Amino acid sequence: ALALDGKLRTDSNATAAASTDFGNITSALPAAVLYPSSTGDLVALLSAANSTPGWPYTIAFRGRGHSLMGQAFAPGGVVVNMASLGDAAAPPRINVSADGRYVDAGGEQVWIDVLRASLARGVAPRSWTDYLYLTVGGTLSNAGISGQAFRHGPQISNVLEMDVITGHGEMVTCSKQLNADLFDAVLGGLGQFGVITRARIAVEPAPARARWVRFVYTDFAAFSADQERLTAPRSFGPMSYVEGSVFVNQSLATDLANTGFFTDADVARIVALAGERNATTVYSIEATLNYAAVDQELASVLGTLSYVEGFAFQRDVAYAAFLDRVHGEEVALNKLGLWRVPHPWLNMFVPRSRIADFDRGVFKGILQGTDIVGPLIVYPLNKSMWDDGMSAATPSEDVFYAVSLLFSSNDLARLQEQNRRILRFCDLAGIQYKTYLARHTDRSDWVRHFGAAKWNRFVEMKNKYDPKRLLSPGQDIFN
Numbered sequence: 001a002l003a004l005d006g007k008l009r010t011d012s013n014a015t016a017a018a019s020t021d022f023g024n025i026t027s028a029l030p031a032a033v034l035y036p037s038s039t040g041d042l043v044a045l046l047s048a049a050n051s052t053p054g055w056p057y058t059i060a061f062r063g064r065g066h067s068l069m070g071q072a073f074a075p076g077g078v079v080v081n082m083a084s085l086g087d088a089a090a091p092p093r094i095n096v097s098a099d100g101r102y103v104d105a106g107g108e109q110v111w112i113d114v115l116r117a118s119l120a121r122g123v124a125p126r127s128w129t130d131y132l133y134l135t136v137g138g139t140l141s142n143a144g145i146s147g148q149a150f151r152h153g154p155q156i157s158n159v160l161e162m163d164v165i166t167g168h169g170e171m172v173t174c175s176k177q178l179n180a181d182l183f184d185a186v187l188g189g190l191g192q193f194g195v196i197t198r199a200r201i202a203v204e205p206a207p208a209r210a211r212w213v214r215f216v217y218t219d220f221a222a223f224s225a226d227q228e229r230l231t232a233p234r235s236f237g238p239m240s241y242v243e244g245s246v247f248v249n250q251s252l253a254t255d256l257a258n259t260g261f262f263t264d265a266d267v268a269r270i271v272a273l274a275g276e277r278n279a280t281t282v283y284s285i286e287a288t289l290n291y292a293a294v295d296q297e298l299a300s301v302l303g304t305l306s307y308v309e310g311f312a313f314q315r316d317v318a319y320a321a322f323l324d325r326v327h328g329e330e331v332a333l334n335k336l337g338l339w340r341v342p343h344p345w346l347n348m349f350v351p352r353s354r355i356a357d358f359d360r361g362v363f364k365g366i367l368q369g370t371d372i373v374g375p376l377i378v379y380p381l382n383k384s385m386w387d388d389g390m391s392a393a394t395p396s397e398d399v400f401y402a403v404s405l406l407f408s409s410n411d412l413a414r415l416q417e418q419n420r421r422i423l424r425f426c427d428l429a430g431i432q433y434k435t436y437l438a439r440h441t442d443r444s445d446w447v448r449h450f451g452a453a454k455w456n457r458f459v460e461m462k463n464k465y466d467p468k469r470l471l472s473p474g475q476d477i478f479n
């Protein structure tokens with residue numbers, strides 16, 4: 001029904017391509033790869049899976065395979081090459097609404113294309129990821145976080161409705177008003193309940209430009225307090241985007257230059273500052289203001305802060321250029337063969353009450369005396385902008401920090417041990433963190449991740465929507 005039409009491929013090249021991911025650490029060969037030309041092909045697969053006794057195959061939905069640890073694999077199963085849904089010229093897979101208040105996007109579509117289509121209509125999504133070559137379905141199955149999330153919530157907080165094909169092979173439109181149980185489960189649901197074939201994304205009138213600043217600190221307490229100041233509810237302050245980064249002394253000059261923000265002259269000034277203060281760690285707030293008026297607005301905001309005088313660094317760019325900033329980093333690194341390497345990334349949400357402790361143990365502790373390659377990102381988020389009824393798991397405090405330690409790799413074994421050590425420190429310190437973008441490998445770890453109540457709901461939704469436990473087996477929750 002599909003294979004004869006050429007859609008279900010079992011050839012070595014197809015299986016190999018769906019057997020690795022961005023993490024470049026784990027691999028798992030599928031039995032087959034589906035290249036669907038339309039959503040009907042997905043309905044056909046999932047309906048067959050549902051109706052066939054002794055159905056053999058788990059099913060994963062490969063967005064662009066940006067997973068770190070095999071989350072998009074179907075070991076001895078079927079990987080869906082989602083990108084195939086966007087092959088045809090017509091009909092379009094991205095539709096900005098007639099009134100420009102939302103954009104409908106295929107689950108397979110990448111956010112960079114969503115941006116381009118939105119900007120053509122003078123609008124843009126309000127909540128992003130740092131890196132735009134990720135699918136709508138993929139980020140929504142996790143959360144989708146960046147510097148706008150403090151004020152707009154993650155991408156899962158900016159979805160009006162979705163089309164989902166469940167594990168029963170039923171096409172279902174869901175929202176807060178209709179099939180809300182599926183809507184809530186799928187968002188941050190780690191691909192466990194069905195495939196998002198369409199998501200309705202909130203947009204706002206597109207800003208033309210961004211005033212883009214980096215502020216330098218040697219004092220973590222001042223750094224974090226200022227981040228919390230900028231992201232505090234008043235309604236929010238003027239900043240459109242707030243992130244931060246950590247720079248360890250040993251690789252200070254290198255890591256500062258690797259941001260792509262600081263000139264060599266800028267780097268020298270910061271190194272000299274760190275030197276005079278004998279600082280083992282340097283911190284930088286990264287913030288934007290979307291828009292002489294900008295000058296005074298910026299000056300007013302900066303006047304509330306306590307960064308080191310002389311260490312505010314400014315850029316002014318087109319909005320789209322800011323949003324796609326990391327693409328240029330990829331192009332450059334890929335030329336030097338430094339993009340397609342093992343990525344033992346550590347991502348977590350750390351409660352505000354323990355962020356200073358984390359800094360002491362990790363940034364001032366474990367990571368000291370190493371050559372770090374890749375950004376160490378740290379910034380506060382507001383729990384109020386997250387829907388706890390959705391599958392995504394966050395710490396219990398009103399404010400928690402996104403902590404993204406994006407190590408690029410004999411280096412691999414060292415970094416894997418280092419990440420275990422960081423987690424060990426957190427566990428022993430009693431820090432109630434939640435992992436993000438990580439898969440756990442036993443029941444107890446997953447139950448702890450979700451917490452008792454949310455786990456029980458997660459299981460209830462699994463029984464309802466994927467009773468055979470076929471979907472996204474690489475998450476290792478029910479597989």
Ligand SMILES: *Cc1cc2c(cc1C)nc1c(=O)[nH]c(=O)nc-1n2C[C@H](O)[C@H](O)[C@H](O)COP(=O)(O)OP(=O)(O)OC[C@H]1O[C@@H](n2cnc3c(N)ncnc32)[C@H](O)[C@@H]1O
Pocket residue numbers: 022060061062063064065066067068071072082107108128129130131134135136137138139141142143144145146190191192194195196197437472474475
């Ligand atoms: C590669 C990477 C990832 C990344 C990032 C930068 C880079 C270079 N920056 C991020 C950021 O700033 N903020 C954020 O929240 N995430 C960021 N990421 C991580 C990224 O979100 C994840 O990798 C995510 O998985 C999206 O990647 P992708 O779209 O390629 O999805 P996948 O890896 O193939 O699949 C992940 C899981 O989701 C399920 N899935 C995929 N599509 C669907 C649909 N349409 N419906 C239901 N489930 C889906 C897969 O089965 C898999 O389990």
Ligand SMILES: *[C@@H]1O[C@H](CO)[C@@H](O[C@@H]2O[C@H](CO)[C@@H](O)[C@H](O)[C@H]2NC(C)=O)[C@H](O)[C@H]1NC(C)=O
Pocket residue numbers: 090091092093094095104105106198
């Ligand atoms: C974008 O809008 C178009 C309507 O112009 C949608 O295209 C239709 O899609 C359905 C089912 O997918 C087909 O039966 C119709 O033949 C299509 N109509 C036209 C005019 O081509 C398209 O599905 C929309 N895309 C998304 C992701 O919502």
Ligand SMILES: C/C(=C\CNc1ncnc2[nH]cnc12)CO
Pocket residue numbers: 130131145326329347375377402403404406
């Ligand atoms: C994975 C996540 C963020 C990644 N952010 C990045 N931000 C800036 N540059 C990069 N290069 C690779 N990843 C990045 C989630 O917080």
Ligand SMILES: *[C@@H]1O[C@H](CO)[C@@H](O)[C@H](O)[C@H]1NC(C)=O
Pocket residue numbers: 020021023024025026027340341342
């Ligand atoms: C990682 O990438 C390299 C290419 O640099 C490849 O040879 C290797 O098989 C990959 N490993 C995994 C597990 O993806």
Ligand SMILES: *[C@@H]1O[C@H](CO)[C@@H](O)[C@H](O)[C@H]1NC(C)=O
Pocket residue numbers: 046047048050051168169170
């Ligand atoms: C799923 O399978 C059941 C039989 O177990 C059947 O009654 C139902 O119609 C099926 N749904 C679809 C859409 O295949």
Ligand SMILES: *[C@@H]1O[C@H](CO)[C@@H](O)[C@H](O)[C@H]1NC(C)=O
Pocket residue numbers: 249250251278279280
């Ligand atoms: C920073 O690292 C360099 C070696 O790269 C070292 O010479 C210097 O003492 C370090 N500074 C501090 C204050 O730790």
